[PDB]
């Protein structure tokens with residue numbers, strides 16, 4: 080009640096699935112109902128900001144990003160925190176206001192050192208907020224390891240959740256774990272992780288549909304880059320993609336799924352068929368690697384060497400895709416162009432949906448009253464012109 | 478000239494089940510308001526439907542035979558076999574169909590095609606809308622149950638090669654071919670210029686090849702997912718037509734699906750219906766073993782064995798068509814997709830009518846259309862079948 084009231088005017092705002100010609104009101108970092116404010120507090124805006132007719136949408140949330148701008152999160156470097164901060168800062172210019180630093184399959188000693196150095200952290204002028212870690216691997220399949228090194232894959236059979244605890248170390252900073260559910264004893268691990276509030280995602284897996292459905296019933300709620308590093312859809316063997324159409328899942332519970340809309344990992348047909356089959360679950364992720372923002376050269380991805388050739392990142396010396404160099408705003412615009420969906424659907428896939436996945440939909444991913452005032456200013460092509468966190472301008476184009 | 482009024486019914490009209498009466502006169506659906514312009518404003522007969530559903534009669538555009546009849550055999554009485562099938566499928570809710578012939582030697586087409594002409598429906602059976610010729614101009618890689626020995630190609634003289642194979646095409650309504658065949662573009666233009674629907678099937682065509690064939694005039698896909706490349710995130714193949722933005726504006730690509738519970742799992746029916754609901758066409762793809770069950774049968778030049786309710790080419794695990802009737806397919810599609818009753822009924826009637834340009838006379842309960850319709854309960858069991866406003870089959874007479 081003791082903070083300044085900001086009124087953003089001459090804008091279209093994404094609210095309730097629609098672009099509305101309505102002002103955005105903010106105080107103390109949260110969005111205000113202006114009618115409630117005048118009718119209970121009898122207060123008007125302390126400051127007005129003309130948005131020039133542009134679009135305001137909730138800031139993007141990237142739940143799978145391995146690094147960027149030369150930073151590799153899967154390295155136990157001397158200043159891990161500095162690298163996270165650099166990425167957090169730079170992705171503001173991509174419209175990203177929250178993200179999950181992601182680590183790929185690594186030896187346990189890397190997790191033991193890196194994980195405690197990347198805790199949850201609120202966004203601000205210092206960069207997008209850190210929502211917690213996404214640990215992708217090592218409990219994934221050899222057949223679909225993709226860019227993950229075979230030598231550091233692990234399994235559960237010995238002592239299940241304790242094997243995972245010994246591998247990663249304390250899980251306080253962890254928010255998502257990608258695993259392959261066909262691993263023996265995955266049920267016990269999925270129960271333990273979700274009981275601790277950790278989202279379980281299915282990926283890098285040769286699981287069939289029934290195994291995937293079992294994993295959802297155990298508590299899994301996410302699919303890691305749909306179509307990538309999993310078996311294809313077959314009309315008598317649907318695999319993980321079949322989760323998008325399954326009627327055997329808990330009634331009314333939304334299974335979410337990431338898609339990499341960089342133009343290389345999935346064709347327009349795949350983005351369209353998923354968006355049409357299950358629009359509410361689609362989550363845009365960058366799956367970015369350290370070459371994000373650099374565009375070329377040799378980089379690392381954990382224990383692997385990565386080479387960027389043209390606009391595509393491969394494990395050095397191979398034709399194995401190893402992440403993306405497309406920032407989130409590029410993914411949003413590509414998803415929009417490739418699917419022919421509405422601007423609202425593209426913006427929701429990059430913010431609302433990841434927020435819902437993580438249970439944050441009351442504070443992030445929306446412009447609803449009471450939510451955090453994390454939003455981006457967009458032109459009609461969905462180019463980012465400005466980024467706000469807690470109602471404060473934290474990045475502006477030039 | 479009698480006016481029939483069906484009362485106490487829900488009718489499928491405009492994509493909705495409406496509690497409205499159905500009026501019929503002269504074999505056609507009647508606008509009751511037209512009676513205000515005539516001398517008599519009351520029906521000559523009223524039929525209380527007990528709250529049941531009236532829907533357009535099913536249209537099966539891919540059925541190879543059934544009940545011991547194999548359309549792809551040059552027997553001494555081809556017409557009698559077609560009539561037998563036509564008669565029996567009334568009990569499955571089917572009031573029109575396209576007898577389908579599989580890959581055969583040219584001598585079979587020359588004898589059989591002239592003996593299966595278009596024929597209106599009636600008490601003697603479902604109407605014949607024309608022939609569906611599936612093959613022989615299809616891929617070796619995806620020939621399925623079609624015999625390798627009788628596949629053919631176009632490269633020599635294209636449409637003339639097709640004419641020499643089939644003989645005169647007057648009775649032909651659909652041709653399934655693989656568009657990656659050389660000179661397929663020419664054949665597709667020639668067929669569609671003559672009013673023949675071209676369907677893509679038994680093909681390893683990539684998406685671009687499939688889209689090109691649509692631009693050439695193709696409007697149908699033969700049993701989606703069966704005998705074609707899978708949906709894939711690098712190149713979706715023919716299935717990608719359901720999501721393509723590269724097709725002629727305003728053209729609905731239609732696609733058949735076999736909803737027998739064996740040819741495609743529920744995920745496939747769901748993913749297609751959600752990606753492109755307006756194009757989905759239910760076909761039985763029935764084979765001569767329909768209604769006979771286990772044992773040895775034929776499918777054209779092939780021997781077929783039905784073992785455990787599944788049809789295979791004898792001595793193989795190669796699927797060779799279906800033994801599920803259309804009403805079973807309708808109910809399976811409904812249950813498997815969770816779609817509306819209206820969507821399931823439209824996929825079995827409206828959509829195949831639209832494919833064939835017949836939506837003003839078949840596949841609808843619109844005014845002026847042919848009064849071909851079925852009486853259904855809420856589980857979509859067919860309890861009665863009407864053609865030209867006349868009752869031609871009834872499940873029982875308990876009511």
Ligand SMILES: [Zn+2]
Nearest residue numbers: 215225303308
């Ligand atoms: Zn991955």
Ligand SMILES: [Zn+2]
Nearest residue numbers: 611621700704
């Ligand atoms: Zn076929």
